[PDB]
Every structure is written in structure tokens, then in C-alpha cells.
Tab-separated table of C-alpha atoms in Angstrom:
chain	number	residue	atom	x	y	z
A	1	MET	CA	140.296	-104.203	69.941
A	2	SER	CA	143.640	-104.850	71.553
A	3	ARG	CA	144.681	-103.919	75.054
A	4	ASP	CA	142.129	-103.008	77.808
A	5	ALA	CA	142.786	-99.302	77.581
A	6	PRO	CA	140.863	-98.547	74.253
A	7	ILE	CA	137.513	-100.037	75.442
A	8	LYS	CA	137.101	-97.739	78.341
A	9	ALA	CA	138.856	-94.545	77.145
A	10	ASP	CA	137.373	-94.288	73.763
A	11	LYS	CA	133.885	-94.931	75.067
A	12	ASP	CA	134.458	-92.272	77.683
A	13	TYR	CA	135.275	-89.668	74.994
A	14	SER	CA	132.197	-90.570	72.901
A	15	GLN	CA	130.016	-89.925	76.052
A	16	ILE	CA	131.763	-86.603	76.490
A	17	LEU	CA	131.108	-85.648	72.845
A	18	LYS	CA	127.515	-86.929	73.160
A	19	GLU	CA	126.945	-84.419	76.064
A	20	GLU	CA	128.438	-81.949	73.453
A	21	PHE	CA	125.925	-83.303	70.926
A	22	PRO	CA	123.804	-79.918	70.907
A	23	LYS	CA	126.996	-77.995	70.045
A	24	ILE	CA	127.577	-79.938	66.826
A	25	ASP	CA	123.924	-79.331	65.761
A	26	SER	CA	123.859	-75.555	66.305
A	27	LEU	CA	127.008	-75.010	64.190
A	28	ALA	CA	125.601	-77.321	61.449
A	29	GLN	CA	122.694	-74.847	60.977
A	30	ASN	CA	125.127	-71.915	60.387
A	31	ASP	CA	127.484	-73.685	57.925
A	32	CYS	CA	127.874	-77.438	56.975
A	33	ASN	CA	131.704	-77.535	57.185
A	34	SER	CA	131.964	-76.482	60.831
A	35	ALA	CA	129.949	-79.400	62.143
A	36	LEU	CA	131.385	-81.826	59.516
A	37	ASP	CA	134.829	-81.268	60.920
A	38	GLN	CA	133.611	-82.829	64.211
A	39	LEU	CA	132.535	-86.204	62.471
A	40	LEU	CA	136.044	-86.713	61.127
A	41	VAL	CA	137.515	-86.787	64.570
A	42	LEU	CA	134.797	-89.181	65.905
A	43	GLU	CA	135.289	-91.870	63.259
A	44	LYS	CA	139.023	-92.118	64.050
A	45	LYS	CA	139.126	-94.227	67.219
A	46	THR	CA	140.562	-97.782	67.785
A	47	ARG	CA	137.616	-99.505	69.595
A	48	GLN	CA	134.859	-100.734	67.278
A	49	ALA	CA	132.184	-100.066	69.788
A	50	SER	CA	132.745	-96.276	70.223
A	51	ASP	CA	132.155	-95.894	66.390
A	52	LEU	CA	128.677	-97.492	66.684
A	53	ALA	CA	127.636	-94.536	68.881
A	54	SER	CA	129.394	-92.158	66.560
A	55	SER	CA	127.882	-93.444	63.299
A	56	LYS	CA	124.427	-92.116	64.493
A	57	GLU	CA	126.034	-88.662	64.434
A	58	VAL	CA	127.293	-89.027	60.867
A	59	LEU	CA	123.650	-89.996	59.791
A	60	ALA	CA	122.049	-87.139	61.923
A	61	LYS	CA	124.181	-84.285	60.720
A	62	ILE	CA	123.164	-84.479	57.028
A	63	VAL	CA	119.537	-84.955	58.143
A	64	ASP	CA	119.726	-81.416	59.898
A	65	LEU	CA	121.035	-79.953	56.584
A	66	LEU	CA	118.203	-81.661	54.766
A	67	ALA	CA	120.304	-82.865	52.739
A	68	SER	CA	121.974	-81.400	49.712
A	69	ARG	CA	123.102	-83.329	46.664
A	70	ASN	CA	126.577	-81.802	46.708
A	71	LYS	CA	126.947	-82.682	50.435
A	72	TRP	CA	125.676	-86.285	49.718
A	73	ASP	CA	128.665	-87.052	47.543
A	74	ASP	CA	131.117	-86.325	50.286
A	75	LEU	CA	129.494	-88.262	53.181
A	76	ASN	CA	129.353	-91.550	51.222
A	77	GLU	CA	132.894	-90.850	49.903
A	78	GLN	CA	134.363	-90.197	53.370
A	79	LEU	CA	133.071	-93.661	54.474
A	80	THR	CA	134.791	-95.359	51.388
A	81	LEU	CA	138.037	-93.605	52.271
A	82	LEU	CA	137.825	-94.712	55.883
A	83	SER	CA	136.996	-98.291	54.813
A	84	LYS	CA	140.299	-98.787	52.730
A	85	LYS	CA	142.587	-97.323	55.451
A	86	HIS	CA	141.241	-99.290	58.469
A	87	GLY	CA	137.660	-98.542	59.583
A	88	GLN	CA	138.758	-99.933	62.975
A	89	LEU	CA	139.049	-103.313	61.209
A	90	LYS	CA	137.458	-103.878	57.835
A	91	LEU	CA	134.620	-105.764	59.468
A	92	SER	CA	133.855	-102.908	61.639
A	93	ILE	CA	133.067	-100.226	59.011
A	94	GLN	CA	130.510	-102.599	57.318
A	95	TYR	CA	128.120	-102.271	60.124
A	96	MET	CA	128.492	-98.506	59.960
A	97	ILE	CA	127.559	-98.519	56.354
A	98	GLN	CA	124.554	-100.661	57.126
A	99	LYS	CA	123.218	-98.001	59.509
A	100	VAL	CA	123.625	-95.037	56.983
A	101	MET	CA	122.112	-97.225	54.158
A	102	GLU	CA	118.611	-97.242	55.800
A	103	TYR	CA	118.682	-93.390	55.715
A	104	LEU	CA	119.431	-93.495	51.926
A	105	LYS	CA	116.219	-95.432	51.342
A	106	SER	CA	113.944	-93.279	53.270
A	107	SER	CA	115.498	-89.954	52.051
A	108	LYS	CA	113.949	-90.860	48.690
A	109	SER	CA	111.225	-88.591	47.532
A	110	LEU	CA	112.921	-87.340	44.176
A	111	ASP	CA	114.189	-88.935	40.976
A	112	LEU	CA	117.095	-86.646	41.801
A	113	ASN	CA	117.952	-88.431	45.002
A	114	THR	CA	117.506	-91.847	43.511
A	115	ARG	CA	120.033	-91.200	40.669
A	116	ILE	CA	122.767	-89.774	43.052
A	117	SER	CA	122.145	-92.555	45.566
A	118	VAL	CA	122.767	-95.425	43.093
A	119	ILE	CA	126.215	-93.933	42.117
A	120	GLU	CA	127.472	-93.972	45.842
A	121	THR	CA	126.094	-97.513	46.704
A	122	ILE	CA	127.496	-99.533	43.801
A	123	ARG	CA	131.060	-98.382	44.669
A	124	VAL	CA	130.980	-99.046	48.424
A	125	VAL	CA	130.101	-102.573	48.336
A	126	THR	CA	132.534	-103.852	45.643
A	127	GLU	CA	135.092	-104.648	48.464
A	128	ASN	CA	132.448	-105.826	50.992
A	129	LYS	CA	130.919	-109.292	51.177
A	130	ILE	CA	127.884	-108.990	53.588
A	131	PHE	CA	124.200	-107.945	53.475
A	132	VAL	CA	125.344	-104.473	52.082
A	133	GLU	CA	125.269	-106.173	48.650
A	134	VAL	CA	121.564	-107.151	48.939
A	135	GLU	CA	120.658	-103.575	49.905
A	136	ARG	CA	122.748	-102.077	47.028
A	137	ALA	CA	121.003	-104.250	44.529
A	138	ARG	CA	117.559	-103.242	45.967
A	139	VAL	CA	118.143	-99.421	45.853
A	140	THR	CA	119.684	-99.907	42.303
A	141	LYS	CA	116.434	-101.636	41.665
A	142	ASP	CA	114.344	-98.586	42.327
A	143	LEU	CA	116.106	-96.964	39.357
A	144	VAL	CA	115.380	-100.151	37.358
A	145	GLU	CA	111.505	-99.526	37.792
A	146	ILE	CA	112.049	-96.018	36.482
A	147	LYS	CA	114.151	-97.404	33.576
A	148	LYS	CA	111.240	-99.506	32.569
A	149	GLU	CA	109.357	-96.369	31.559
A	150	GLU	CA	112.245	-95.607	29.183
A	151	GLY	CA	114.207	-97.294	26.318
A	152	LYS	CA	116.676	-98.354	29.029
A	153	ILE	CA	114.460	-101.406	30.031
A	154	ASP	CA	116.903	-103.783	28.123
A	155	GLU	CA	119.941	-102.149	29.742
A	156	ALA	CA	118.872	-101.974	33.445
A	157	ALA	CA	117.602	-105.489	33.400
A	158	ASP	CA	121.170	-106.612	32.511
A	159	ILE	CA	123.004	-104.593	35.135
A	160	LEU	CA	120.884	-106.247	37.769
A	161	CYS	CA	120.747	-109.898	36.416
A	162	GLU	CA	124.450	-110.253	37.041
A	163	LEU	CA	124.390	-109.285	40.708
A	164	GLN	CA	122.112	-111.960	42.285
A	165	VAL	CA	123.914	-114.976	40.737
A	166	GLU	CA	126.557	-114.385	43.504
A	167	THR	CA	125.085	-116.157	46.481
A	168	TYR	CA	125.346	-114.114	49.605
A	169	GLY	CA	125.205	-116.094	52.820
A	170	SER	CA	123.491	-113.114	54.480
A	171	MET	CA	120.172	-113.848	52.580
A	172	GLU	CA	117.503	-116.269	54.098
A	173	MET	CA	115.905	-118.890	51.872
A	174	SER	CA	112.702	-116.762	51.550
A	175	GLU	CA	114.782	-113.695	50.458
A	176	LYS	CA	116.912	-115.823	48.100
A	177	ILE	CA	113.703	-116.977	46.243
A	178	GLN	CA	112.296	-113.503	45.951
A	179	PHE	CA	115.368	-111.787	44.554
A	180	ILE	CA	115.897	-114.433	41.857
A	181	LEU	CA	112.112	-114.219	40.904
A	182	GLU	CA	112.732	-110.505	40.284
A	183	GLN	CA	115.533	-111.323	37.925
A	184	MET	CA	113.336	-113.868	35.907
A	185	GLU	CA	110.614	-111.077	35.263
A	186	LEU	CA	113.305	-108.599	34.061
A	187	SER	CA	114.356	-111.056	31.471
A	188	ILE	CA	110.909	-111.318	30.075
A	189	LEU	CA	110.824	-107.574	29.771
A	190	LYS	CA	114.364	-107.582	28.335
A	191	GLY	CA	113.170	-110.089	25.810
A	192	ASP	CA	116.198	-112.435	26.479
A	193	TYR	CA	114.909	-115.844	27.273
A	194	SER	CA	118.287	-117.512	27.315
A	195	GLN	CA	119.063	-115.616	30.642
A	196	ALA	CA	115.811	-116.749	32.094
A	197	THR	CA	116.548	-120.370	31.734
A	198	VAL	CA	119.753	-119.977	33.668
A	199	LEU	CA	117.825	-118.044	36.519
A	200	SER	CA	114.911	-120.669	36.652
A	201	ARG	CA	117.408	-123.422	37.482
A	202	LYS	CA	119.183	-121.325	40.022
A	203	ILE	CA	116.504	-121.754	42.692
A	204	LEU	CA	115.149	-125.271	43.007
A	205	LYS	CA	111.859	-127.155	43.216
A	206	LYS	CA	113.310	-128.852	46.289
A	207	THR	CA	113.259	-125.569	48.205
A	208	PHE	CA	109.525	-125.619	48.500
A	209	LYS	CA	108.412	-128.094	51.094
A	210	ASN	CA	106.997	-126.029	53.983
A	211	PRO	CA	103.896	-123.707	53.831
A	212	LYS	CA	106.159	-120.659	54.523
A	213	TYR	CA	107.302	-120.864	50.916
A	214	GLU	CA	103.837	-121.411	49.549
A	215	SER	CA	103.445	-117.993	48.085
A	216	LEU	CA	106.719	-117.782	46.299
A	217	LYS	CA	105.966	-121.310	44.872
A	218	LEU	CA	102.955	-119.879	43.054
A	219	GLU	CA	104.894	-116.960	41.416
A	220	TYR	CA	107.700	-119.294	40.533
A	221	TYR	CA	105.688	-121.638	38.332
A	222	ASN	CA	103.522	-118.879	36.838
A	223	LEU	CA	106.664	-117.220	35.591
A	224	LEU	CA	107.830	-120.497	33.894
A	225	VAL	CA	104.408	-120.736	31.979
A	226	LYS	CA	105.324	-117.564	30.047
A	227	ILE	CA	109.049	-118.409	29.362
A	228	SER	CA	108.049	-121.643	27.758
A	229	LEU	CA	104.937	-120.382	25.986
A	230	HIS	CA	107.175	-118.063	23.946
A	231	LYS	CA	109.272	-121.028	22.950
A	232	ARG	CA	106.054	-122.855	22.128
A	233	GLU	CA	106.679	-126.107	24.105
A	234	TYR	CA	103.130	-126.699	25.044
A	235	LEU	CA	103.445	-129.865	27.192
A	236	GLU	CA	105.782	-128.094	29.719
A	237	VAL	CA	103.257	-125.272	29.963
A	238	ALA	CA	100.509	-127.769	30.954
A	239	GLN	CA	102.858	-129.190	33.558
A	240	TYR	CA	103.388	-125.923	35.418
A	241	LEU	CA	99.593	-125.199	35.684
A	242	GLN	CA	99.190	-128.791	36.971
A	243	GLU	CA	101.733	-128.068	39.747
A	244	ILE	CA	99.782	-124.803	40.748
A	245	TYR	CA	96.722	-127.065	41.009
A	246	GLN	CA	98.738	-129.357	43.296
A	247	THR	CA	99.444	-126.226	45.495
A	248	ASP	CA	97.284	-126.210	48.702
A	249	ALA	CA	96.004	-122.595	48.321
A	250	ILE	CA	94.462	-123.224	44.896
A	251	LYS	CA	93.131	-126.668	45.982
A	252	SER	CA	91.282	-125.373	49.021
A	253	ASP	CA	89.435	-122.463	47.402
A	254	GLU	CA	86.856	-122.992	44.731
A	255	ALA	CA	87.402	-119.663	42.828
A	256	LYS	CA	91.219	-119.936	42.364
A	257	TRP	CA	91.276	-123.284	40.510
A	258	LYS	CA	88.605	-122.089	37.835
A	259	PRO	CA	90.863	-120.550	35.098
A	260	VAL	CA	93.877	-122.885	35.988
A	261	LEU	CA	92.063	-126.183	35.024
A	262	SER	CA	90.620	-124.481	31.955
A	263	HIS	CA	94.084	-123.537	30.888
A	264	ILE	CA	95.438	-127.058	31.609
A	265	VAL	CA	93.108	-128.572	29.045
A	266	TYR	CA	94.139	-126.100	26.302
A	267	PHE	CA	97.950	-126.677	26.401
A	268	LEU	CA	97.631	-130.395	26.672
A	269	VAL	CA	95.638	-130.491	23.464
A	270	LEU	CA	98.062	-128.040	21.786
A	271	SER	CA	100.826	-130.497	22.467
A	272	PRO	CA	101.251	-132.834	19.514
A	273	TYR	CA	100.640	-136.548	20.557
A	274	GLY	CA	103.465	-138.249	22.683
A	275	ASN	CA	102.461	-140.971	25.118
A	276	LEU	CA	103.353	-138.806	28.109
A	277	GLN	CA	100.863	-136.311	26.677
A	278	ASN	CA	98.111	-138.977	26.798
A	279	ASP	CA	98.367	-139.937	30.463
A	280	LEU	CA	98.283	-136.346	31.673
A	281	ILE	CA	95.088	-135.534	29.666
A	282	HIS	CA	93.441	-138.698	30.995
A	283	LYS	CA	94.353	-137.809	34.504
A	284	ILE	CA	92.491	-134.502	34.106
A	285	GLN	CA	89.606	-136.404	32.559
A	286	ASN	CA	88.963	-138.011	35.977
A	287	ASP	CA	88.839	-134.615	37.901
A	288	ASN	CA	85.527	-133.642	39.475
A	289	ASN	CA	86.003	-129.910	39.600
A	290	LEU	CA	86.227	-129.838	35.696
A	291	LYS	CA	82.778	-131.472	35.428
A	292	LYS	CA	81.043	-128.298	36.732
A	293	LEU	CA	82.433	-126.433	33.633
A	294	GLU	CA	80.921	-127.868	30.575
A	295	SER	CA	82.957	-126.058	27.939
A	296	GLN	CA	86.327	-127.414	29.036
A	297	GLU	CA	84.733	-130.748	29.820
A	298	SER	CA	83.401	-131.350	26.241
A	299	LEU	CA	86.894	-130.220	24.890
A	300	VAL	CA	88.940	-132.641	26.910
A	301	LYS	CA	86.512	-135.438	26.186
A	302	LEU	CA	86.575	-134.912	22.378
A	303	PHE	CA	90.358	-135.177	22.134
A	304	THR	CA	90.758	-138.165	24.484
A	305	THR	CA	88.243	-140.515	22.856
A	306	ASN	CA	88.499	-141.568	19.226
A	307	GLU	CA	86.200	-139.527	17.039
A	308	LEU	CA	85.890	-138.185	13.496
A	309	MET	CA	85.179	-134.480	13.464
A	310	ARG	CA	85.397	-131.584	10.983
A	311	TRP	CA	87.378	-128.387	11.547
A	312	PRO	CA	84.982	-125.337	10.672
A	313	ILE	CA	82.245	-126.893	12.833
A	314	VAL	CA	84.479	-127.432	15.826
A	315	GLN	CA	85.820	-123.846	15.122
A	316	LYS	CA	82.285	-122.552	15.037
A	317	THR	CA	81.570	-124.205	18.459
A	318	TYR	CA	84.514	-122.809	20.302
A	319	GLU	CA	84.888	-119.364	18.573
A	320	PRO	CA	82.397	-117.500	20.882
A	321	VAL	CA	83.494	-119.629	23.832
A	322	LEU	CA	87.195	-120.340	24.191
A	323	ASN	CA	88.668	-118.046	21.619
A	324	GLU	CA	87.452	-114.977	23.685
A	325	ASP	CA	88.957	-116.353	26.873
A	326	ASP	CA	92.242	-114.378	27.226
A	327	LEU	CA	95.726	-116.015	28.090
A	328	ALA	CA	94.950	-118.998	25.834
A	329	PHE	CA	93.529	-117.840	22.620
A	330	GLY	CA	92.398	-114.235	23.187
A	331	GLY	CA	95.952	-112.758	23.326
A	332	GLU	CA	97.741	-111.642	20.094
A	333	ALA	CA	100.491	-114.292	19.783
A	334	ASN	CA	97.735	-116.615	21.092
A	335	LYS	CA	95.862	-115.967	17.881
A	336	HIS	CA	98.645	-118.186	16.573
A	337	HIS	CA	97.989	-120.755	19.324
A	338	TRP	CA	94.300	-120.775	17.945
A	339	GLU	CA	95.695	-121.442	14.507
A	340	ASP	CA	97.611	-124.200	16.128
A	341	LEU	CA	94.409	-125.780	17.470
A	342	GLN	CA	93.544	-126.735	13.845
A	343	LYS	CA	96.811	-128.666	13.276
A	344	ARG	CA	96.145	-130.698	16.435
A	345	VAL	CA	92.456	-131.515	15.154
A	346	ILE	CA	93.612	-132.595	11.630
A	347	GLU	CA	96.479	-134.685	13.328
A	348	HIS	CA	93.786	-136.327	15.563
A	349	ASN	CA	91.732	-137.246	12.512
A	350	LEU	CA	94.884	-138.598	10.765
A	351	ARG	CA	95.707	-140.902	13.730
A	352	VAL	CA	92.131	-142.286	13.944
A	353	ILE	CA	91.735	-142.831	10.304
A	354	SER	CA	95.179	-144.550	10.192
A	355	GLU	CA	94.127	-147.276	12.595
A	356	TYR	CA	90.621	-148.044	11.468
A	357	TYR	CA	90.961	-147.483	7.711
A	358	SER	CA	93.315	-149.874	5.960
A	359	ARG	CA	92.824	-147.929	2.667
A	360	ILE	CA	90.906	-144.796	1.660
A	361	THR	CA	90.878	-142.672	-1.475
A	362	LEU	CA	92.842	-139.435	-1.247
A	363	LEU	CA	89.952	-137.575	-2.752
A	364	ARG	CA	87.845	-138.548	0.221
A	365	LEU	CA	90.421	-138.027	2.963
A	366	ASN	CA	90.786	-134.318	1.768
A	367	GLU	CA	87.065	-133.722	2.257
A	368	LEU	CA	86.953	-135.122	5.788
A	369	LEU	CA	89.967	-133.215	6.924
A	370	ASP	CA	88.808	-129.907	5.394
A	371	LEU	CA	92.170	-129.405	3.586
A	372	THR	CA	93.340	-128.758	0.066
A	373	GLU	CA	95.195	-131.546	-1.777
A	374	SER	CA	98.620	-130.033	-1.292
A	375	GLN	CA	98.365	-129.476	2.464
A	376	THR	CA	97.077	-133.104	2.961
A	377	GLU	CA	100.160	-134.674	1.452
A	378	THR	CA	102.657	-132.527	3.449
A	379	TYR	CA	100.825	-133.317	6.709
A	380	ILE	CA	100.872	-137.071	6.098
A	381	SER	CA	104.629	-136.745	5.327
A	382	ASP	CA	105.633	-134.873	8.482
A	383	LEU	CA	103.749	-137.280	10.682
A	384	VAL	CA	105.634	-140.248	8.925
A	385	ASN	CA	109.026	-138.601	9.609
A	386	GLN	CA	108.036	-138.360	13.341
A	387	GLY	CA	107.468	-142.022	13.106
A	388	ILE	CA	103.973	-142.427	14.663
A	389	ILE	CA	101.984	-143.405	11.606
A	390	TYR	CA	102.669	-144.965	8.186
A	391	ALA	CA	100.952	-144.589	4.834
A	392	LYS	CA	101.747	-144.645	1.129
A	393	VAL	CA	100.100	-141.745	-0.639
A	394	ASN	CA	99.711	-141.745	-4.450
A	395	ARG	CA	100.506	-138.389	-6.283
A	396	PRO	CA	97.902	-139.256	-9.038
A	397	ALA	CA	95.511	-139.025	-5.995
A	398	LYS	CA	93.894	-142.397	-6.259
A	399	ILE	CA	94.449	-143.682	-2.756
A	400	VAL	CA	96.257	-143.354	0.511
A	401	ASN	CA	97.000	-146.783	2.054
A	402	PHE	CA	97.082	-146.193	5.794
A	403	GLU	CA	98.752	-149.487	6.697
A	404	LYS	CA	102.236	-150.574	7.130
A	405	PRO	CA	102.211	-153.605	4.799
A	406	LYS	CA	101.939	-156.637	7.007
A	407	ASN	CA	104.644	-159.340	7.261
A	408	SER	CA	104.296	-163.026	6.128
A	409	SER	CA	105.412	-164.608	9.366
A	410	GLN	CA	103.118	-162.525	11.577
A	411	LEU	CA	100.066	-163.307	9.507
A	412	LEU	CA	100.713	-167.068	9.686
A	413	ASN	CA	101.450	-166.706	13.457
A	414	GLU	CA	98.177	-164.946	13.887
A	415	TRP	CA	96.254	-167.697	12.084
A	416	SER	CA	97.893	-170.576	14.015
A	417	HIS	CA	96.750	-169.073	17.317
A	418	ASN	CA	93.082	-168.734	16.271
A	419	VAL	CA	92.943	-172.454	15.596
A	420	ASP	CA	94.240	-173.265	19.069
A	421	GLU	CA	91.489	-170.815	20.470
A	422	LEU	CA	88.676	-172.759	18.638
A	423	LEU	CA	89.922	-176.105	19.985
A	424	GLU	CA	90.276	-174.717	23.530
A	425	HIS	CA	86.859	-173.150	23.313
A	426	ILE	CA	85.093	-176.438	22.406
A	427	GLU	CA	87.073	-178.348	25.133
A	428	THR	CA	85.861	-176.083	27.885
A	429	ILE	CA	82.262	-175.935	26.439
A	430	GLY	CA	81.750	-179.752	26.649
A	431	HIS	CA	82.344	-179.724	30.469
A	432	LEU	CA	79.684	-177.050	31.096
A	433	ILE	CA	77.126	-178.985	28.988
A	434	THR	CA	77.578	-181.933	31.352
A	435	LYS	CA	77.321	-179.590	34.395
A	436	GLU	CA	73.935	-177.978	33.178
A	437	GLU	CA	72.123	-181.137	32.063
A	438	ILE	CA	72.605	-183.046	35.296
A	439	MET	CA	71.823	-180.085	37.576
A	440	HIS	CA	68.591	-179.914	35.650
B	1	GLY	CA	144.911	-137.756	27.724
B	2	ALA	CA	143.820	-138.410	31.284
B	3	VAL	CA	144.092	-134.838	32.463
B	4	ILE	CA	142.001	-133.718	29.524
B	5	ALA	CA	139.254	-136.400	30.492
B	6	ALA	CA	139.443	-134.956	34.080
B	7	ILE	CA	138.968	-131.473	32.595
B	8	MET	CA	135.554	-132.180	30.967
B	9	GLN	CA	134.282	-134.048	33.893
B	10	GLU	CA	135.373	-131.414	36.454
B	11	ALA	CA	133.912	-128.664	34.172
B	12	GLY	CA	130.608	-130.400	34.098
B	13	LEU	CA	130.747	-130.576	37.911
B	14	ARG	CA	131.031	-126.760	37.804
B	15	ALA	CA	128.084	-126.810	35.265
B	16	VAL	CA	125.728	-128.015	38.047
B	17	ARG	CA	126.896	-125.230	40.365
B	18	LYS	CA	126.432	-122.462	37.890
B	19	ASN	CA	123.092	-124.198	37.056
B	20	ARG	CA	123.489	-124.889	33.427
B	21	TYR	CA	123.473	-128.023	31.320
B	22	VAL	CA	126.267	-126.628	29.200
B	23	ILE	CA	129.928	-126.270	29.681
B	24	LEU	CA	131.596	-123.008	28.692
B	25	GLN	CA	135.157	-121.833	28.235
B	26	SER	CA	135.277	-120.328	31.694
B	27	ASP	CA	134.730	-123.737	33.204
B	28	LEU	CA	137.420	-125.137	30.999
B	29	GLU	CA	139.966	-122.441	32.002
B	30	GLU	CA	139.611	-123.161	35.812
B	31	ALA	CA	139.701	-126.980	34.979
B	32	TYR	CA	143.019	-126.078	33.252
B	33	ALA	CA	144.339	-123.890	36.104
B	34	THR	CA	144.389	-126.586	38.743
B	35	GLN	CA	145.154	-130.297	38.641
B	36	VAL	CA	148.492	-129.191	37.079
B	37	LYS	CA	150.095	-127.034	39.867
B	38	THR	CA	151.002	-129.837	42.450
B	39	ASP	CA	154.240	-129.556	44.744
B	40	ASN	CA	156.358	-126.678	45.782
B	41	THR	CA	160.025	-126.775	44.839
B	42	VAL	CA	160.176	-123.137	43.879
B	43	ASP	CA	162.094	-122.272	47.095
B	44	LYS	CA	164.479	-125.239	47.020
B	45	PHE	CA	165.491	-124.525	43.361
B	46	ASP	CA	166.445	-120.820	44.395
B	47	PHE	CA	169.732	-122.363	45.741
B	48	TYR	CA	170.095	-125.057	43.036
B	49	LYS	CA	169.702	-122.417	40.170
């Protein structure tokens, strides 16, 4: 580092011990300790450079042993001990570690190795601050995969979720996206969805702009479909599939967009009214690629336009069609997204009937909806709390008066305007009579 | 009252960093730590003790 004497002299010695490289090897075959004793000397120098040369020898020696679990503990330990003392500067020993760390990866061919290796790696890097930390997490992560096949899937997932929140400057944008995606998946498997919302917001939508990041954009939004679908917010779920459809890769290729559009229609319907909900399902109603499918096309069309329809007949239509399409209705907790399809159909009929029918008997309304008396009243009530419609339902079951009782002033206002339209209408007509007679 | 108004606002700055829409007690404790340790007179008061 300092003076001009260490650069030359130290290098000179490492050359001399690199000519004496076969000597170190031959002794290593007879006993480990004899050759080990040589590595100790090498990694005490004062120039940073001469330790680069020498940190090949530290990696090579244990390779010639091949490799020994007991011996493994010591090599990684010796490094840790050298780091605290000096390491020829604390920045120096981090590049040494980085060289030996590739060997750890590729040594791997046992469970046995993997377990010992994670114990050495976690410790080293707690006082380091570079790319070492990415690599530690990654090798730790091999044992995570293995932990998945155990009861330790909850536990492992946690260990690892913590780590990547610390933003290392050593990662590239492409690596940063990938590592956080891994965390989001582990949280699904953990079954903690609270963790996953914090990880989704960690990376941004404003990191995907160039076609380099195209791939990781697709995995990103697909992951958010599940996180939400579990919390049953069905409008948000439509939204992610719509963004995947906006992706260039899906757009270009005919095959890729097929299940995505199908899925789009389902979660938009499953969403209960909202005016935002309406403009999204009308946007999809315009799309050309949907019109080739006829099952999704009739479904979207039904819900958009104002119709009266009955639930076991709609159920009979789409039971052998849509209900057997997986990741919508054919999953298990999507059996209860099928059940949900009914609520959305009987809310559609309530909205229609509210507008057009000013009054209808309750006895009748029950029949058309395909519900029992009790379940009709509670559904009317919930939809009046949520402030969309208004009714007055009798408990004797004589009527339901789907109207909000009209106000005196508005009625009179409405009447005064009609009279002005009659007088305007006649005033314009008289001119056009004159026009037609003379032209004839 | 002002420092306490600065606390919630600075905590919710830290909210964006951490990438949450909620403020926790960890945010509050750092908000507390600073904005209240201005000047050094420690040295001067050694000889005015």
C-alpha cells in the first residue's frame, strides 16, 4: 500500500513461492497440515496485489484434499480471523472471499456440503458491505429449496425475506428485480401475505420501461394476481391481467393472449359494480381478439348490457364450459369464486329491476331472482347500505318499491320544461312548412 | 408541539423509503433521535463544570 518497497518485494516472494507451487501440493497429499502451514505465511503480506496471487493457492489446496467437512470449517474460519485483524486493508480481503465463494458453489454435490457451507457464509459477510452479501443469500437459498420439502418452509422463507430489503449497490437493476421476486413467492408459500405487500412495493412499476426488463415484468404482475386473489379484491386482479395484455410479448403472439383475456372477463364480472369497474369491462368489449372466442364473448356481453336472466339456467350454460377451466373456477378456493358468480348475477338483476320497475310485488321479485324470501330481503338491504340503489321492502311481503320517492320541486321543474319543449317544437316546425311548400 | 408535528411528517417520509403506507414505532424512534441534538457545547462545559 504505502512506500514503494512492498509492491516489488512482496510480489517477488509470491513468484518465488509460485515456482515452489509443486512442493506445497506434494506435501498436501501426505498430510493436510503440512501444506496448510504454507498458506498462513502467504496471506500475511502488506501489498494487496501479492494476496490476489496467493488466494488461488488457498482455494487450490482444499481442492487437492477433496475436501473434507472438518477441513472446511477451518479454511473459512481462517479468512474471518484474517479479515478482523487487517486483511491488508479491510477492502482487500473482500475480494479474496469473492474468489473462494465461487468454489463453495461448485463443490456442491451433497446435502452435507450445502448445510456446512451455509454456516460459514452467513458469518463472513455480517461485517462486509459488497456483492458477498448477494452471494451469501443465494447459497443460503439453495438450503431454502430443500426446506420447502420439509415443515421448515415457513421458517426458511423468513430468514431470507429479511436479507434483500437491504439494498446493496453492487446489484444491477435486473438482479435487484429478480431477487425481490424470489422473496414475494416465498411469502406465498409461507402463507404470510402481509410480508408480500411490503415486497411488491419495494420494486416499482417505473423500473420497467426498456425491453431488457420485459421478462421480469411478466413474473412481477403474475405474482400480484395471486396475492390479491387470496384477499378476494377482484378488480385489482383484472387490472394485473390487463397489464400483461399490454406487454409486447403477449400482444405479438396469438397463443399467449388466449387464457389471459378469458381470465380478464371473469374477475371483472366478479367485482361488484363500481363505475371504474364499468369502463374497464366496456374497454374489453371493444377488443377483436375476444371475438374469436365465443364463450368469453357471450359472458362479457351479458353483464355489460341490461338484461333479465335467471341463475340455474345461466349456471347450466357455463357449468361444462367455464367452471372446468382451471385458475378461475376449476381450482378449490375458486369453487368459492363460482359461488360468487351467483351474487354478481342476482346483484345485476337487482340493479336493472331498480331502474325500470317503479314498484313490484315481493312475491314476484323472489321468483325472478331464484332466491328464498329471507335471502331476498338481506340482499336488498346490503345493496342499500352501499348506497347504489334504494327501495322500501314490506315484511308482510306485499311489495318492494324500487324508487327513491321523488321530490315536489323536481317534478314541477320537470313539467315546466316539457311545456317550453312543445312551444319550441311548434316554432321551428312552422318555418319548415313554409320551406317545403314553396320549393314544391 | 412543533417538533412532534415534524416527527410524524419525517416518519412518513421514511414510510416511502421502507415502502409502506404505514408508520411504525421504529420510524418514530429515529424521528425522536434527531432534530433534538443540535450544537456542541459538551467540550466547552468541561471547563465551566
